[PDB]
């Protein structure tokens, strides 16, 4: 609905939450459809949740047994970096990914002692904790982000955006203030006004 | 830019002359108003766009007000029939 | 690349084909007008081609105001074409 | 009388038309309920449904609930709820105009809120400034499927269909402009008849064209502009003076 | 991306798959009486099948005049597989294309894993419990079955 | 109801003798679940009213059987409550004086009404009738928005 | 923030009205700017919900109710009010309304009353206006169709006629007044009138209705002392009877006019 | 050259005062240093 | 109110619960060759023999069925008198020894073609609107009804009057049925604005046909090339659809020009494939080219011609009839 | 040039759009304000002319040629009492400018 | 979507070979596929 | 003034509401579409609540209390997964031992494919 209200029907959202263009886009279409990190973070979190829910659905259909389910949940939580692409819009999630990798190492080398290689390790509780504690701090950020986006959708954009003095604007603003200073001095001292 | 202005006036005079021909042919087409570039754009003929009336002073203006109204409506009838 | 070769991409053309099949949608301005009118059988689509001739003569007549001779020639030729379309839907 | 019978169900719930309009683009927009990616083909179509006042009128829940407003879909000849409808299923009459006489300044007889300015199209609900009683009737060629018909014959058709829908002041047909003007006694009947006759055909069952009546575009019924005829203008001034003199009586007797 | 779609331009992947499927079918025809085959059927497979990388179907389906003795699954170049174990009258050939990389260009491991994965789903991909998967690696130009 | 699982214990004796009635209630609810794709808001509300009625009626079956007919053991009643064939908290309302025929719990949730009142369907019909007569009209209330109930005062 | 401006006729006669306030809930119908919406019902069980359509500063600018836009002293619409005042004042005043949206927003914020509002916004002026108002109340194919029209024959008892021809119709007369007076005479009827022709035709449901019509008083019919004249039209009529174009209708009207002036 | 101009007057802040805020949550306007210090006296 | 009066008031509610109501209410053809003396009150169904058309089967009003020869005498061989109501549909089983008959009497009867013997008879709870049978099996038949069910029968089965299965995915009355010429799948159309394709003896439709502007389709048939099928929609246009496993419509195969609405007009195909035909309410026997949907001609044959049928070998020959009773041959 | 009232309306729309655009982009050009007001005096629409002079005064009330133009414009069209109100206002806001007193 | 998107959406029924064959049939009737020149941006190679 | 606890609805009611909001083409769904877009800011909270209540390997089917908007816009899992820490440790230790034994004993462990659908 957010895609369609913005008129971007030339973008399609898969039922596994990939966003793909339906056609090669014009430049005006590309500028008009340039969705931001708020949308994409939301989309990829839905994608992650979709993967987890789909494994439970597979278990409940009888397609995979409980051990396969445990291993699947563990694999998803360890391989968010490959399955989800969420780092592209929030690169600080690499801490979570790195923590999951470290946890996988210590869990495996406790688990696989005298077993050897191959799938089967379903002890998914630590990585699960990592991602929940990430969601803790991601809730206020995404609430602010998505709120501002949807506010722009309904209320529209503020008329009076005051640009700050960043270093790209520094010299121009210096010139304006210097010019005004010279003009104030000379128009004050001239007798004829 | 002056080339663009020339072309714009060419298109305007095209519409004007075509409207005049059709008026001589007895099919009275109305002139097309310009398209609004944005939803809140202004047509300056519909209203006195930001009317700031003179603040009323001590002297009565009524007689010369109705005289000015007479003058304006006379001019309007004149341009209607004489062009 | 430009708008034109994006619009003439295989995906866009296939979507146009699917839309004219699935819902009857066809932007006639994309397509070359029939030279011979009599091969057109529907009153609806013949009238739509007539509309194309109409918007064409409007856009040409905007440019009439070598130039006058060639554009007058094309203008009266398009009026001949318009006559043929009106004749065809009238018969 | 319509009071003697319960209202007929005009159209069954399963017989109602789809909400998705005819395709005019490549993709259906789930927000706007309209087609995106291109805009080609006309959006007008002939209504499958038409009101039949003597047949379809009758009592509803609205008469028992003390309702004021008329059913929009009854006028369109496609009300699904029939006697269970909250809204009134009959042609407006002086009783109901009297009941509407407070709300009528800012509301339609259908209970829709009026606007300050008319649409540029002169379509839609109408202005609370004007209190217009006159409908423009265009698209008459499409309403007849381009059938050739004499002007008095067209006028007789327009006279028949609009006179079912209220008390009428004037009907005139203009051959040169190929358009009709219908003026009602009450603005509520003009409001009603506009929605009742919008997108309809003028064809008859007796016509040879009747079996393909759905193919074109129907009647184009809009609010009329002020009549530029000087006779009509001085008539308008006379009735304005009469309305003013009648109102002086009320102001004086109240104060 | 540009270089690899330039190599695989004009649907070369599907062309490779179709041509190899046809080659295996057309040489199985020349041994129909030798292998006691009642019929060799090239399957009308969905167009995305050639690059459907998580699912599969039979490319060729093959009927027996009288039932075959078949081995437990084994690679193309293993020699001691014995036919006494199992009996069947229908078999399939599945042709899988891959584009390998430095981590994975042991096509034998790929075909073994894909076979044991696909043939043991809850929902059966194939028209019979017995068959052969053939694999071709396009990046490294290798084959196994 | 709650899906059968290792979590759940087997049904006590007597569940087999009431199972046909419960299964038909299940059948009706399975039918009512579906996307019938109603176009109108009014008829879309009516389809939720159907579900609320079915919920009420199955709970009334179990309620009358246990508390009034006394044809059901405490063990079987506890099992039906635990597996949620019956609404626990609505049955708790039917046990109270003045609520013996209550339709649903939302219609007495005073803290979410605009005026802080109950739903109008809990007014006795005679009171609405005499108010309408004193005003000089028929009664305008037909069905309440929450569940489609037409009146569930215990006098009615 | 000013209080809502709602008239008693909107509020009704119940002793207490509950009203719901919604800050910035609605956009004003006159000026498009947001405002505090009020909405209420006249009683709890009334089924229509009344809401403020215009903001308070637009309402005070015009001296009107926010819920029905009638004048908050005289309970009449702006056009009729400004017309009434401009009969008592020689110099006309009218409510000039903005058409551009920026001018709509601009006009609403200037705190100056508009049109007839100031003349009605205090009792002294409004009472003076009504005192003066009391003084005001104290003070070409015609040659063919004229044989299709029944003009040679007369209003009679004996011939059973279901259809009639009407002429000397003044253009002021609406169609409904004609049907209404025939309804009064019959104690209750397809009518065609062409006002550019100044004539028309009346067709009854069955012959006994036409006979009852001719039973009550070439004949005459009265509409506010306009003397519509009436003739039995045995030959059936249609809309074509009065001419196929506007010019034919006008020519027919002049012909009928000179025929009337001869008859009188 | 006419796109490229000096500043004759600056934009007046009175224009921004003429209409209401539109509810965008800026990060720098989130709560912070919520208690004022006061001096000894 | 007294308690007794409240008790009586409770009993007046239309319902035994809180939802009880208080409410008040309680090649090209050219010209006609001959005509047979069909049913005087009107013919409602016609059929040629399926593989070789030497005989014409007829049913209509006057509650009777009759069979005529197409050569050498042009006379009725025999009549079948066993119906109480007008014949709705007739269908020769795919082995010519028998034909199915349905009528508005809610009775479906299968008759021996050569002897005129009722092989079996079915009584139904709803009016049948079509009867059809498998190309692979003469004993198997199917019946579409007004109550939106489709009953399936094999006459060898005695259990439950031979009802082998029932289909349910239709919200209103069935109007037409047709097997694929292979007979493994069948098609059905409904009063509900949709058509379905079904696996034989399976209660799940393998495809659904729907569009935002689709009208109902009271008749359906297969083109002799069998790659395509066709139906007469109430839009006064005939439509054609693929029988290939995609089952999608084909875009330019629209067939307009005939007044169909409110009548069960039939559509028929030339045996060479290349031409198609339909009736009309005002008796114009229309024809079209199948290759390009181009119009061919109409004949003003002596009234609604609801039935048409085309001979499997006699090129340019077609039969028609309707309420006029007489059965005209071109 | 112009043969019809509708054509006059088109001309007036174009010129008004031009002048209003420039005065939107740069309001401090007092000469531009003056000649826009002069344009509306040429159209004989004194309400518009008065409004433009008033807006120009709101941009800068201290600029004496703008006051003199407005006063002279009122007097040129015989609107003496308007001019009297205007001159009284002029001296009332700028009492130390000799030119307004002399005018 | 970004400039360097890897994937475009194909409908589930999309056969690429049939799509190209249909688009080839369509290409012979489109105006801008059959006009006689290609628009380009270029520098003037010499003074003229 | 006075409080009573939130009524718990039949689950079929919520199920119906999600089913009916499948297409949302009719004009009756405009307010619902707006509610859907306003729900979007609360999705990460709902995602946290769902994943937080995820079934552990030893339980087949976890019934959870939910809070849902009557437009169908969003469903929150409205409960906290409280556990007894020595019991939770014992449960996960049993799960650990069982999974170890299964990796040992199962000749071929067939992993899932991702995305599963
Ligand atoms: O890159 P790592 O984090 O270390 O993990 C690698 C694998 O993960 P992926 O690269 O995603 O496939 C993992 O299998 P998975 O987790 O997928 O089930 C293997 O575990 P095992 O074979 O099942 O025991 C590891 O083998 P060990 O080295 O014995 O830990 C392997 O390490 P390696 O890359 O050094 O060989
Ligand atoms: Zn209704
Ligand atoms: Zn209740
Ligand atoms: Zn309830
Ligand atoms: Zn209730
Ligand atoms: Zn306002
Ligand atoms: Zn009011």
Please measure the distance between the N-terminal and C-terminal CA atoms of chain J and give it in whole angstroms.
38
Q: How many whole angstroms separate alpha carbon K18 and alpha carbon K11?
A: 13
Residue J49 CA to residue J65 CA, distance in Å, equals 16
Cα gap A32→A35, rounded to integer Å: 8
Instruction: List, in sequence order, every residue forming a beta bridge with A11; answer none if it has no partner.
Output: A21
**Mind giving me the DSSP string for D183-205?**
EESSHHHHHHHHHHHTT-----T
- Is-contact I80 I74, C-beta < 8 A? no
DSSP conformation letters of F8-61? SPPPPTTHHHHHHHHHHHHHHHHHHTS-----SHHHHHHHHHHHHHHHHHHHHH
Q: Which ligand is located closest to the Cα atom of residue F153?
A: 3
Residue D116 buriedness (CB in 10 A; 0-12 / 13-18 / 19+): middle
Biggest distance spanned by C-alpha atoms of chain E: 52
CATH T-level topology, domain I1-330: Methylamine Dehydrogenase; Chain H (2.130.10)
Residues 6+ apart with CB under 8 A from L30: none
Q: How many whole angstroms separate alpha carbon I218 and alpha carbon I89?
A: 13
Domain that holds residue G123: 1-138
Contact D80 F40 (CB under 8 A): yes
Ligand 7 centroid from CA G76, angstroms: 10
Is the CB of residue G257 less than 8 Å from the CB of residue G212?
no
Both structure tokens of A160: 């009076």
The Å distance, Cα I233 to ligand 6 centre, comes to 55
Residues of C in contact with A32 (CB under 8 A): none
C-alpha G117/C-alpha F30 separation (Å) is 64
- Chain K window 9-48: which residues touch C at a Cβ cutoff of 8 Å? 10-11, 14, 19-20, 22-23, 26-27, 29-34, 39
Residue entry with tokens 């498998």? I134
Q: Is E39 helix (H, G, I), strand (E, B) or coil?
A: strand
Q: Which of A99, A108, A121, A122 to mutate to test the pocket of ligand 1 (most atoms within 8 A of CB)?
A: A108
Dump the DSSP string for F65-106. Answer: IIIII--S-HHHHHHHHHTTSS-HHHHHHHTSTT-TT---SG
Angstrom distance (rounded) from CA I202 to CA I186: 11
Long-range contacts at B70-78 (CB < 8 A, ≥ 24 apart): B71/J44, B71/J77, B72/J44, B72/J45, B72/J46, B75/J44, B76/J5
Residue L25: half-sphere exposure toward Cβ, Cα within 13 Å: 15
Using CB atoms within 10 A of its CB, is residue D66 exposed (0-12), middle (13-18) or buried (19+)? middle
How many whole angstroms separate alpha carbon D128 and alpha carbon D130?
6
Distance F103 CA to ligand 4 centre (A): 5
Q: For residue E47, give the nearest of K4, K6, K16 by CB distance.
A: K16
Which atom belonging to ligand 1 lies closest to the Cα atom of A82?
11
Residue (of G239, C85, C6) closest to D156 by Cα position: G239
- Report the atom number in ligand 1 closest to the C-alpha of A104: 3
Q: Are strands E131-137 and E86-98 parallel, antiparallel or unpaired?
A: parallel
Structural domain boundaries of chain F?
Answer: 1-155
Question: CB of C21 within 8 Å of any CB in chain I?
Answer: yes
Cβ atoms E36, E65 nearer than 8 A = yes
Q: What is the dihedral of CA A137, A143, A144, A145, to 10 degrees?
A: 100
8 A C-beta contact, residue G52 and residue G6 = yes
Burial classification of residue G90, based on how many CB atoms lie within 10 Å of its CB (0-12 exposed, 13-18 middle, 19 or more buried): exposed
SS3 I99: strand
Ligand minimally distant from the alpha carbon of residue A98: 1
CB contact under 8 A, C24 and D23: yes
Chain F contact set for G18 (CB, 8 A): 115
Prior bond to L115 cis, omega within 30? yes
Considering only CB atoms, which residues of chain F are within 8 Å of chain I? Answer: 49, 53, 56-57, 60, 101, 103, 121, 125-126, 142, 148-152, 155-156
Does the Cβ of A74 fall within 6 Å of ligand 1?
no
Which sign, positive or negative, has the C-alpha torsion F68, F72, F78, F81? negative
Q: Which of I218, I233, I240, I329 is nearest to I290 (CA)?
A: I240
Distances (CA, A) of K26 to C36, D162, K37: 19, 49, 20
Q: Indicate yes or no: CB of C18 within 8 angstroms of CB of K39.
A: no
Which residue, among A17, A119, A147, would best test binding to L if mutated, counting the most L CBs under 10 Å from its CB?
Answer: A119
Judged by CB atoms closer than 8 Å, whether chains meet at C20 and I249 is answered as no
Helix, strand, coil content of chain C in percent (nearest 5): 75, 0, 25
Mark whether B and L touch (3+ CB pairs within 8 Å): no
- Count CA atoms within 13 Å of residue A102 on its CB side: 7
Locate F54 and state its tokens: 């079915």
Give CA–CA dist I313/I50, Å, rounded: 11
How far is the C-alpha of I133 from the C-alpha of I113, rounded, in Å? 15
Question: Does the beta-carbon distance from L113 to E54 stay under 8 Å?
Answer: yes
Residue in F with minimal Cα distance to G20? F114
CB atoms within 10 A of CB A119: 18
Distance G27 CA to ligand 6 centre (A): 8
Q: How far is CA E124 from CA E47, E110, I153, in A?
A: 20, 20, 33
Q: What is the spatial distance between Cα A49 and Cα D92, in angstroms, rounded to a whole number?
A: 57
Cβ contacts of G196 within 8 Å, gap of 6 or more = D172, G246, G249, G250, G253
| A113 CB within 6 A, ligand 1 | no
User: Would you give the DSSP letter of residue G71?
Assistant: B
Tokens 């039918």 map to which residue?
Answer: F31
User: Per-domain residue ranges for chain I?
Assistant: 1-330
Q: Do I321 and I305 form a contact (C-beta atoms < 8 A)? A: yes
Taking the Cβ of residue A4 and every Cβ of chain D, the question of whether any pair is shorter than 8 Å is answered with yes
Flag if D36 and A22 touch (Cβ within 8 Å).
Answer: no
* Pairing mode, strands I295-300 and I284-289: antiparallel
Chain A residues lying within 8 Å of L21, measured CB to CB = none
As to burial, measured by CB atoms within 10 angstroms (0-12 exposed, 13-18 middle, 19+ buried), residue D126 is buried
Q: How many angstroms is it from F103 CA to the middle of ligand 5?
A: 7
- Which chains would you list as touching C if contact means 3+ CB atom pairs under 8 Å? A, B, D, I, K
| Method by which this entry was solved | cryo-EM
For E22, E27, E62, E64, E71, the CA distances from E34, given in Å and listed in that order, are 19, 12, 14, 12, 18
CA distance I294 to chain C (A): 9
Alpha-carbon gap, residue I55 to I49, rounded angstroms:
6
Angle between helices A125-154 and A94-111 (to 10 degrees): 160
Residue G10: nearest ligand to its CA? Answer: 7
DSSP state of L40: G
Q: How far apart are CA C22 and CA C14, in angstroms?
A: 12
| K6-14 CB contacts, 8 Å cutoff, 24+ apart | K6/E1, K7/A18, K7/A20, K8/A20, K8/A21, K8/A22, K8/A23, K8/A24, K8/C11, K9/A12, K9/A14, K9/A20, K9/A21, K9/A22, K10/C11, K11/C18, K13/I246, K14/C14
Asked whether A119 lines ligand 1 (CB < 6 A), one says: yes
Report the neighbours of F using a cutoff of 3 or more CB pairs below 8 angstroms: D, G, I, L
Give residue F40 CA to ligand 2 midpoint distance, Å.
Answer: 12
> A117 CB under 6 A from ligand 1?
yes
CA distance E86 to chain L (A): 20
Whole-number Å distance between alpha carbons of G246 and D180: 13
């Amino acid at each position: 609905l957010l895609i369609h209200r913005k008129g971007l029907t030339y973008l399609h959202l898969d039922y596994n939450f990939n966003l793909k263009p339906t056609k090669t886009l014009t430049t005006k279409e590309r500028k008009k459809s340039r969705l931001g990190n708020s949308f994409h973070l939301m989309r990829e979190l839905l994608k992650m949740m979709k993967l987890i829910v789909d494994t439970h659905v597979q278990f409940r259909l009888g397609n995979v047994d409980a051990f396969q389910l445990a291993d699947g949940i563990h694999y998803i939580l360890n391989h968010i970096g490959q399955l989800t692409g969420i780092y592209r819009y929030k690169y600080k999630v690499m801490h979570q990914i790195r923590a999951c990798k470290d946890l996988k190492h210590i869990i495996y080398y406790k688990f696989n002692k005298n077993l050897g290689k191959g799938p089967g390790c379903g002890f998914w509780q630590p990585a699960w904790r990592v991602w929940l504690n990430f969601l803790r701090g991601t809730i206020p950020l995404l609430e602010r982000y998505i709120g501002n986006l949807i506010t722009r959708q309904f209320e529209g954009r503020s008329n009076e955006i005051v640009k700050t003095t960043t270093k790209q604007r520094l010299d121009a603003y210096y010139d304006l203030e210097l010019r005004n200073s010279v003009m104030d001095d000379i128009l004050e001292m001239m007798p004829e006004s | 830019k002056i080339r663009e202005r020339m072309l714009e006036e060419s298109k305007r005079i095209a519409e004007l002359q075509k409207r005049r021909e059709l008026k001589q042919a007895g099919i009275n087409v109305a002139i097309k108003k310009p398209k609004k570039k944005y939803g809140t754009d202004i047509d300056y003929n519909e209203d006195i766009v930001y009317e700031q009336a003179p603040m009323p002073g001590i002297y009565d203006t009524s007689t010369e007000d109705r005289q000015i109204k007479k003058k304006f409506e006379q001019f309007e009838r004149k341009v209607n029939r004489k062009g | 690349s430009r708008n034109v070769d994006k619009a003439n991409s295989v995906l866009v053309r296939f979507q146009e084909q699917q839309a004219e099949s699935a819902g009857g949608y066809k932007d006639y301005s994309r397509y070359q007008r029939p030279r011979n009118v009599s091969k057109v059988k529907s009153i609806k689509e013949a009238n739509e081609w007539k509309r194309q001739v109409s918007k064409e003569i409007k856009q040409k007549s905007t440019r009439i105001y070598m130039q006058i001779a060639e554009l007058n020639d094309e203008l009266n030729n398009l009026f001949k074409e318009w006559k043929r379309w009106q004749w065809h839907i009238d018969h | 009388s319509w009071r003697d019978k319960s209202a007929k169900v005009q159209v069954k719930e399963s017989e109602l038309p789809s909400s998705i309009p005819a395709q005019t683009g490549l993709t259906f927009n789930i927000w706007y309920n309209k087609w995106s990616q291109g805009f080609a083909g006309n959006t007008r179509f002939v209504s499958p449904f038409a009101l039949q006042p003597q047949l379809h009128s009758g009592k509803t829940r609205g008469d028992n609930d003390g309702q004021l407003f008329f059913c929009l879909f009854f006028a369109k000849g496609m009300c699904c709820l029939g006697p269970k409808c909250e809204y009134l299923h009959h042609i407006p009459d002086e009783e109901d105009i009297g009941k509407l006489a407070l709300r009528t300044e800012v509301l339609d007889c259908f209970g829709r809120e009026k606007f300050a300015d008319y649409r540029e199209d002169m379509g839609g609900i109408g202005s609370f400034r004007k209190k217009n009683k006159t409908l423009y009737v265009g698209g008459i060629d499409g309403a007849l499927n381009s059938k050739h018909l004499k002007p008095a014959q067209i006028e007789s058709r327009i006279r028949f269909v609009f006179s079912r829908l209220g008390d009428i002041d004037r009907i005139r047909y203009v051959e040169s402009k190929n358009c009709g003007f219908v003026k009602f006694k009450y603005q509520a009947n003009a409001e009603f008849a506009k929605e009742a006759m919008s997108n309809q055909t003028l064809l008859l069952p007796s016509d040879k064209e009747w079996d393909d009546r759905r193919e074109g575009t129907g009647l184009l019924v809009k609010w009329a502009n002020e009549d530029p005829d000087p006779a009509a203008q001085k008539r308008l001034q006379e009735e304005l003076k009469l309305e003013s003199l009648n109102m002086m009586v009320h102001l004086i007797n109240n104060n | 991306k540009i270089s690899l779609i330039q190599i695989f331009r004009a649907h070369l992947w599907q062309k490779i798959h179709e041509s190899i499927v046809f080659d295996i079918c057309q040489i199985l025809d020349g041994e129909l009486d030798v292998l006691q085959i009642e019929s060799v059927t090239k399957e009308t497979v969905h167009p995305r099948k050639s690059y459907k990388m998580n699912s599969s179907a039979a490319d060729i389906t093959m009927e027996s005049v009288h039932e075959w003795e078949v081995s437990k699954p084994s690679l193309l170049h293993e020699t001691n597989d014995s036919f006494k174990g199992l009996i069947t009258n229908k078999m399939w050939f599945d042709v899988q294309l891959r584009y390998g990389d430095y981590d994975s260009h042991d096509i034998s491991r790929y075909v073994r894993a894909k076979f044991l994965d696909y043939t043991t789903d809850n929902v059966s991909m194939y028209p019979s419990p017995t068959g052969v998967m053939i694999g071709i690696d396009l990046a490294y130009n290798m084959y196994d079955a | 109801p709650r899906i059968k699982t290792r979590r759940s214990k087997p049904a006590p004796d007597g569940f087999e003798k009431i199972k046909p009635t419960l299964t038909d209630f299940e059948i009706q609810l399975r039918d009512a679940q579906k996307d019938k794709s109603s176009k109108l808001a009014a008829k879309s509300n009516e389809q939720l009213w159907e579900i609320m009625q079915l919920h009420h009626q199955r709970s009334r079956y179990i309620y009358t059987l246990y508390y009034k007919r006394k044809a059901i053991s405490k063990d079987l009643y506890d099992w039906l409550i635990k597996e949620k064939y019956a609404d626990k908290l609505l049955i708790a309302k039917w046990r109270k004086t003045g609520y013996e025929k209550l339709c649903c719990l939302r219609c007495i949730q005073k803290n979410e009404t605009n005026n802080g009142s109950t739903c109008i369907c809990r007014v006795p019909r005679a009171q609405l009738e005499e108010e309408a007569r004193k005003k000089g009209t028929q009664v305008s209330f037909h069905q309440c928005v929450h569940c489609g109930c037409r009146g569930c005062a215990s006098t009615d | 923030e000013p209080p809502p401006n709602i008239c008693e006729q909107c509020l009704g006669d119940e002793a207490n009205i509950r009203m719901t306030k919604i800050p910035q809930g609605s956009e004003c119908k006159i000026c498009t700017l947001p405002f505090t919406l009020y909405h209420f019902k006249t009683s709890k069980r009334s089924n229509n919900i009344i809401k403020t359509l215009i903001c308070v500063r637009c309402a005070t600018q015009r001296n009107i109710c926010q819920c029905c836009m009638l004048d908050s002293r005289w309970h009449i619409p702006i056009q009729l009010r400004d017309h009434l005042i401009s009969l008592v004042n020689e110099e006309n005043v009218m409510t000039e309304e903005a058409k551009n949206d920026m001018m709509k927003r601009f006009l609403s914020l200037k705190n100056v009353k508009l049109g007839g509002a100031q003349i009605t916004s205090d009792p002294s002026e409004a009472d003076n206006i009504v005192d003066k108002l009391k003084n005001i109340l104290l003070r070409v194919d015609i040659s063919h169709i004229l044989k299709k029209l029944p003009l040679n024959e007369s209003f009679l008892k004996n011939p059973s006629t279901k259809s009639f021809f009407l002429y000397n119709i003044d253009a002021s007369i609406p169609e409904w007044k004609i049907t209404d007076t025939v309804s009064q005479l019959l104690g209750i009827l397809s009518l065609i009138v062409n006002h550019k022709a100044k004539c028309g035709g009346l067709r009854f449901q069955s012959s006994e209705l036409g006979e009852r019509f001719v039973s009550k008083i070439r004949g005459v019919l009265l509409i506010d002392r306009f003397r519509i004249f009436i003739i039995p039209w045995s030959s059936g009529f249609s809309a074509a009877s009065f001419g196929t174009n506007t010019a034919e209708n006008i020519k027919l009207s002049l012909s009928l006019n000179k025929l009337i002036q001869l008859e009188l | 050259t006419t796109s490229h101009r000096p500043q004759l007057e600056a934009r007046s802040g009175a224009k921004a005062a003429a209409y209401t805020p539109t509810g965008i949550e800026h990060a720098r306007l989130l709560p912070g240093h919520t208690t004022l210090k006061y001096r000894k006296f | 109110f007294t308690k007794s009066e409240l008790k009586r008031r409770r009993k007046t509610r239309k319902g035994d619960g809180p939802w009880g109501s208080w409410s008040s209410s309680d090649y090209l053809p050219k010209k006609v060759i001959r005509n047979y003396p069909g049913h005087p009150e009107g013919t409602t169904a016609l059929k040629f023999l399926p593989k070789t058309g030497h005989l014409i089967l007829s049913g209509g009003n006057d509650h009777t069925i009759k069979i005529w020869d197409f050569y050498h005498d042009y006379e009725c061989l025999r009549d079948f008198q066993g119906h109480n109501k007008p014949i709705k549909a007739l269908r020769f089983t795919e082995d010519c020894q028998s034909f199915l008959s349905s009528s508005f009497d809610r009775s479906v009867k299968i008759w021996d073609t050569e002897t005129g013997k009722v092989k079996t008879r079915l009584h139904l709870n709803s009016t049948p609107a079509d009867v059809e049978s498998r190309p692979t099996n003469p004993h198997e038949f199917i019946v579409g009804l007004s109550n939106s069910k489709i009953l399936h029968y094999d006459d060898r089965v005695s259990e439950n009057q031979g009802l082998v299965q029932t289909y349910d995915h239709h919200l209103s009355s069935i109007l037409a049925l047709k097997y694929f010429p292979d007979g493994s799948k069948f098609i059905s159309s409904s009063e509900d604005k949709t058509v379905r394709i079904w696996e034989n003896q399976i209660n799940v439709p393998i495809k659904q046909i729907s569009d935002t502007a689709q009208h109902s389709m009271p008749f359906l048939n297969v083109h002799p090339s069998q790659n395509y099928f066709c139906a007469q929609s109430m839009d006064n246009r005939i439509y054609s659809f693929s029988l290939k496993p995609k089952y999608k419509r084909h875009p330019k195969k629209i067939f307009k020009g005939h007044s169909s609405a409110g009548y069960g007009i039939s559509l028929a195909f030339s045996g060479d494939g290349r031409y198609i035909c339909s009736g009309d309410s005002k008796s114009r026997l229309f024809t079209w080219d199948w290759n390009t949907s181009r119009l061919l001609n109409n004949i003003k044959i002596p009234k609604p011609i609801t039935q048409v049928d085309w001979h499997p070998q006699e090129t340019s020959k077609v039969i028609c009839s309707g309420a006029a009773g007489k059965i005209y041959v071109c | 040039d112009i043969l019809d009232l509708e054509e006059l309306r088109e001309y007036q729309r174009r010129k008004r759009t031009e002048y209003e655009g420039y005065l939107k982009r740069n309001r401090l050009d007092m000469g531009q304000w003056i000649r826009y007001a002069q344009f509306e005096i040429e159209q004989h629409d004194m309400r518009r002319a008065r409004s433009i002079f008033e807006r120009a005064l709101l941009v800068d009330s201290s600029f004496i040629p703008l006051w003199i133009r407005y006063i002279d414009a009122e007097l040129k069209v015989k609107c003496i009492n308007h001019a009297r109100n205007l001159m009284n206002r002029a001296i009332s806001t700028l009492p130390r400018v000799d030119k307004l007193w002399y005018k | 979507s970004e400039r360097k998107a890897i994937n475009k959406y194909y409908p589930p029924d999309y056969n690429p070979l049939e799509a190209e064959k249909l688009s080839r049939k369509m290409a012979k009737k489109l105006k801008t596929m059959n006009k006689s020149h290609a628009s380009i941006r270029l520098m003037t190679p010499f003074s003229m | 003034n006075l409080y009573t606890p939130k009524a718990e609805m039949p689950p079929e009611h919520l199920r119906k509401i999600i089913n009916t909001h499948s297409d949302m083409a009719s004009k009756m769904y405009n307010t619902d579409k707006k509610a859907f877009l306003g729900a979007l800011k609360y999705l990460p909270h709902a995602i946290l609540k769902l994943l937080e209540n995820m079934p552990h390997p030893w339980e087949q089917a976890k019934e959870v209390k939910v809070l849902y908007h009557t437009s169908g816009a969003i469903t929150f899992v409205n409960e906290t997964p409280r556990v007894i820490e020595p019991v939770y440790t014992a449960q996960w230790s049993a799960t650990w031992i069982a999974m170890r034994r299964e990796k040992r004993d199962r000749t071929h462990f067939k992993r899932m494919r991702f995305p599963p659908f």
